[model samples]
Target: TCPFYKKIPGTGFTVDAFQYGVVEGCTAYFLTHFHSDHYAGLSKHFTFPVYCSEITGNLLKNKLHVQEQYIHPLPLDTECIVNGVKVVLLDANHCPGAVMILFYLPNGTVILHTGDFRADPSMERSLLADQKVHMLYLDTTYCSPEYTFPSQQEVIRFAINTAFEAVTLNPHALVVCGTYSIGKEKVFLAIADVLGSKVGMSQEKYKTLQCLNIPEINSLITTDMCSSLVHLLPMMQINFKGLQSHLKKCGGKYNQILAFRPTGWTHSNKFTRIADVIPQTKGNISIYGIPYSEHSSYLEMKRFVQWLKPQKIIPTVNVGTWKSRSTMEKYFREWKLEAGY
Candidate 1:
């Protein structure tokens, strides 16, 4: 079990309830996001009640489908008390159901746990207004110069223009775009807005979009729904091999097909090996190089840490192991206090 506080015999260290002891005495609990790496362990091991945003609760219950009665759901930016500890949720801007948790102790020591946040100005503005943080448990997954993402608006515009070009070249083609189940709703919305009355979304995409409840864009249709006009379907769930085969089969009939993918799999070195297997289609298959990353870049992380000026800056997500811990310790030593034991 990951203990929040330093070791203190029995009172501070809490074991996994499924293995040894139940998490019974903690004053409060905080969840940063509904990602599997963070919340997957909770349903099986931790039984202590948790305080999270309403979107997080809905995501856990509706999307991840974990049923737990101890969750105390509050709205975004709203404050509440769980057990005895005060808690507040802020937008993480990584995924639709993501949030950054702020925990305020009775003694006034504040701890901010950032799940996986990007460098979006919306999120930065929100956090800049919150100046009461003392300790920060941050996400440093992309704390390196190699990671970078373009602005959301830029990505949307690129995808729309690319899709339009592909369709104009070949009228009978289909466009397939792959995105994260939770984060890529905006990309699809952009496509819908460009297409206007011609927008068509698959059943799965429609359901996912409805769950997110994005205000600017809705009421889109799928290719099947728009039998007369061109169909733009999201490649919501398709493996590389499967997508290649489908594209190959449809290449003869369709005029042009465009596929959009986020920066995740494409950024990795293994993309070359995967790209080798997929055959080139007769129709154009434009892979737009639009960047839409969820995690913050190195500079962004540094900016956030510097702004908070926490007494203890703990690198929580993707930096817990001994090797990574030591590396992060040396890196962060130049900025703030060393992490707690």
Candidate 2:
């Protein structure tokens, strides 16, 4: 037996590399997400096959640019038995392609490992409810009462209101919102809905919109229509001089240019530079700051845990267990007092 798993180390059970190797008793391994902390150790020490969601595989392929034979793609919500252990994938709403893994042991123990999940009502209701979850390794990134986020719908409404305000102020302004390439496609669709036939996009974004099967909220406009109303373009294509020159040649004449950037632009200097490279058009360019995130807040996390009433709650990412335990204990104590326990 490995030293780490011998006892519940520190606050909980610990499993070191050697202990992990011994416990598995096999050369193969499984991964939960592409986050560096989760996969970094495996990348360094283990050469065994790693099973993950296809979207995660796509991201790893893009990030590592490696053709490793050990990586295998598993579809979401599918169960597979590898080396006598059962593995199941569940959607984790934290980021694009993130998954919450479920490990079922032969001894009748079930462990649900949530890898950096956001409390998305739709995703949670759809993915987590249908099964019997025994033990939850949750993402308690925000377990404190102080940390809270506005609801997803509320954030979207704020974003839409901001966009509408800009449009009403200057209908001829070219608005650009910076968002992740793969994740924030929904936000763009929302904006398109409000803009209607007045919005324009590149051929690539148009194709992406179709492939995503997004509801048709607005009619596609050509370069010729840039003069009449607001134009919607991806952050990537907005930089290429060729595309900029084309927009110029198409007689792009607007009174103002309004740009909206999603979360990353604030932290990444490169994104800031990209925002600056919108070209000095005849119209004035102004970048709009809209704070919108998809993740759940601390209050939501607490409420979710209360509703589930799991036997044991284990948090995966940060937000230490002290606060989580305290909150749960307080609630349970109050319930017991009422129940005469």
Candidate 3:
């Protein structure tokens, strides 16, 4: 009865994100992304045959250290078979190795698992043109009107420019970025390339980018305080302590630290709308909130639901632990066009 698991009745084929120990048996397991939430189920030494993009596959093997026998790396746009069902993985455009799964079943059921993706018009071709989507496991992270902002790429343009500006203000100031290990590596690399600085990260995140093997964004790494203008640091609840630590590590070499986070939450303010960077000054450090989300905005989500027209909507965020069932479906369905009775 939960949105987590959906079964195709006749065929045992399933889609997207089965956490360890809480999962039931299925013919095959399809993973959409490498985000910690989606991958929280995976641990060392799994038994199920997991299907995902090659980069995700490498992370699973190298980072998570899963056995090779249990992992099935899939090439994007290529249709493959698993236990008699046809499946194809498409670029989700969320992160490095994220994908949107299309399960073409024997009963003509076309189920889409958009693990965690921003809406793109280019993705329409991957689905069946003649038929409707039977089911859609959507990532409704920003399923509200308050999340309206520029696209990730556009924000990338704004953020890169802003970071460069911050660096130009003072050569000794550090442009410290808050991010996940794998989520926004592109933001880091893009900034590094434009700033003429070496990408700085923990050894583990450096290892992850190397394993992902993305050449266009292939940049060098460093832990030194003076080596680079930008340091991609892991996010913290309140980054003041982290700033304190960085100051101590660098022996006060930094004249400034612009701590910025690449997320949609920067636009959460009800009054004003922002393109890319929203600067907030707190204490001596300058904090900037950048709009760099990979999730669909409310209007975008509404459009997606309207086009696909699924019979049911499985919401990802919980309005309530259990009581708020169907509330989001109704909220979202309000945007969809009414079928003429």
Candidate 4:
């Protein structure tokens, strides 16, 4: 949804706009996270410097093969001077290395680039509460009224309970959890911990976990797929056809499969609570399309926008189409009007 080129006003800087050639007058680059959409143009042959969180920095250097000298990994919640402008990094709660960047310009303007965030109530009372923000680059991933999703904890609770019930019904069931290359670690990790099962994943995913630096993750990961009932697979492989191939590849050790496909796109507001959500069943396979998103929901975005009420709002996503972007802007205006600003 992000445009090809994104440049910050009042500064010679660009954030998450690396997919193309450098922007005019661009002197510095900032990466909010390691997601391919955000860091699309980055490659080993890249020449410019990039500022990001220490975790993102590690992933960039190791995965993208970018030089260490060009990466400046900054700690979170601290203010620093970059090109004479005060800059601060705040946890975005979207992914492991994601952050919301705050910029204090020389002309007394405060700008925030919420690269991609899952809203946390803590943000409303933090530094933003006291500052008079002039501009906000919002992550409008789920900015529509139709895109309402439950909180991460509630979805996890439902997932754990559902997995437990399915495995109890079919003791030979294989618990397969689908996820992106990164993010959604909490969902699969919770299922494995609660069910007391070992986890199986490809070496690439294991390497990514290693960079995360979580101690428990290392102990739970096992290379032996037969020893583990719980397996982590890419989101695309959670389909019925894919699962059939996976089951055969494993030599049919498990009679049935209980898989969880977690993402916000699967969420529908027809159900009020997680208990009402149901799974799709076909033969020996049961798929639960749970809403476990790393992005903010419609309500969360409304609350966040109204709380800040920045002088201007620049949406960072859903910008390819004017119709989509226009629809998103209406909500921003409505939220501001309700905020009495």
Candidate with maximal lDDT: 4
What's the lDDT for candidate 2?
A: 0.53
State model 1's lDDT.
0.58
- Candidate 2 stretches with Cα past 4 Å from truth are 1-47, 121-134, 168-171, 180-182, 196-255, 263-288, 319-341
Note the residue pairs that clash in candidate 1.
172-255, 173-255, 200-221, 200-222, 201-221, 201-222
For residue 202, what is the lDDT in candidate 3?
Answer: 76
**Which sequence of candidate numbers ranks them by lDDT, best first?**
4, 3, 1, 2
TM-score of 1: 0.75
Clashing pairs in 2: 175-258, 176-259, 176-260, 177-260, 178-260, 178-261, 178-262
Give candidate 4's TM-score.
0.95
Model 1 residue-pair collision total: 6
Q: How well does candidate 2 match the true structure in TM-score terms? A: 0.61
Which predicted model would earn the best TM-score?
4
TM-score of every candidate relative to the true structure: 0.75, 0.61, 0.88, 0.95
What is the lDDT for 88 in model 3? 78
Candidate 4 lDDT score relative to the true structure = 0.85
Report the C-alpha lDDT of model 1 over 106-193, residue by residue, as the tens digit. 7767777676777555665764466666677677787655655555676676677766766666677566656545676666556655
Q: What's the lDDT for all of these models? A: 0.58, 0.53, 0.72, 0.85
**Model 3: per-residue Cα lDDT over 1-341, one tens digit each:** 32444444456655554654545556677777787867867867678888889999999998889999999998988878878888878888788899987778787878877878888766766644446777777787777666677666777787788778877877777778887657766677778888888877777877787777677544457765467777877787327777767766777778677777776665364655555236777566777677677777776777667777787666655545454456566666576546311
lDDT of 1 at 338: 42
Tens-digit lDDT track for model 4 on 1-341? 33533778789888998877867777889999989988998989888889999999989988899999899998888888888888999989987989999999888989999999998888986667768888889899888887877778888888888888878887888999997768888888888888898789888887787777666676788777888889988899999999988998888688899998876765356545677877788888888888788999888888888778788888888888989988988888889888898
